[PDB]
Copies of this chain bind each other. A is one copy, B any other.
Amino acid sequence: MNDVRNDDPNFNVMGNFDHGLTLALSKGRILKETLPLLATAGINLLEDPEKSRKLIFPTTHKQVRILILRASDVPTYVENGAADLGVAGKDVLMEHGAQHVYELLDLQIAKCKLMTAGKVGMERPKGRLKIATKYVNLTRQYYASLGEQVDVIKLYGSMELAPLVGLGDYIVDVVDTGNTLRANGLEPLEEICKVSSRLIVNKASFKRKQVLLNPIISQLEQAVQSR
């Protein structure tokens, strides 16, 4: 039983294999809409990670370190217990189909729609369709829902490029406003599901470290104006 939790000294503490808490966060617009909410719970960074060479950022909590991961890695880290909890699009989480995990909260930030997409004035091709996409299992299940089997093409980069150079017949990506799409002579077509960032917790992490977690979770819920 020690007391002090507050931590001003940054570039300090951090440590390895924290048996305190270890928070994995996606690194895109998600990050920026996320840290506001963590603010509410007395968990804040002490520098600009944009401008740090640091790999494990310490926080205002002596008991919480932070990782900025590639958004595909977050469920990998929490699945395995490298992270006790983190934040990711339901898109990633559904595709990853992570095992040893609890989704505890729709943060209702970074909201958008997993959609099929096509070239402006597209023509339906002939035979088995090719689909350029980052989310394989999700399109494979969405076309399995319409009975059609398709040819898939995995990409890790910008999916907007694929149609303009003629990689796919169609693509599957997240559409927020889908303004970017129009600007590149492309169209939103259909809707596969609606999508927001979620808070996930390793199950065993949750069994033991409840003492630390409960306060944090409660505060995040309230920050969403959880009615």
Which residues on A are within 8 Å of B, measured CB to CB? 16-17, 22, 55-56, 67, 69-70, 72-73, 76-77, 80, 82-83, 153-158, 160-162, 164-167, 184
Given contacts A22-B165, A70-B155, 5 further A-B contacts (CB under 8 A): A55-B164, A69-B157, A73-B155, A76-B154, A82-B167
Q: Could you tell me if A161 and B56 are in contact, using CB atoms closer than 8 angstroms?
A: yes
Please report the C-alpha to C-alpha distance between residue A184 and residue B54 in the assembled complex, in whole angstroms: 10
A-B contact list, 10 entries, CB within 8 Å? A16-B164, A16-B165, A67-B161, A69-B157, A76-B155, A76-B167, A77-B165, A77-B167, A82-B167, A83-B165
Which chain B residue shows the least CB distance to A183? Answer: B53
- Report which of B67, B157, B158, B162 forms a contact with A165, defined as CB distance below 8 A: B67
3 tightest Cβ-Cβ pairs between the two chains A and B: A70-B157, A82-B167, A73-B157
Please report the C-alpha to C-alpha distance between residue A165 and residue B69 in the assembled complex, in whole angstroms: 13
Q: Could you tell me if B166 and A82 are in contact, using CB atoms closer than 8 angstroms?
A: yes
Please indicate the chain B residues that have their CB under 8 angstroms from the CB of A83 in the complex.
165
- Report which of B67, B72, B166 forms a contact with A16, defined as CB distance below 8 A: B166
Q: Could you tell me if A156 and B156 are in contact, using CB atoms closer than 8 angstroms?
A: yes
- Report which of B17, B77, B156, B167 forms a contact with A70, defined as CB distance below 8 A: B156
Q: Could you tell me if A156 and B55 are in contact, using CB atoms closer than 8 angstroms?
A: no
Please indicate the chain B residues that have their CB under 8 angstroms from the CB of A67 in the complex.
161, 165
Q: How far is the CB of A172 from chain B (nearest CB, A)?
A: 15
Please indicate the chain B residues that have their CB under 8 angstroms from the CB of A70 in the complex.
155-158
Please indicate the chain B residues that have their CB under 8 angstroms from the CB of A82 in the complex.
162, 165-167
- Report which of B158, B161, B166 forms a contact with A17, defined as CB distance below 8 A: B166
Please indicate the chain B residues that have their CB under 8 angstroms from the CB of A162 in the complex.
82
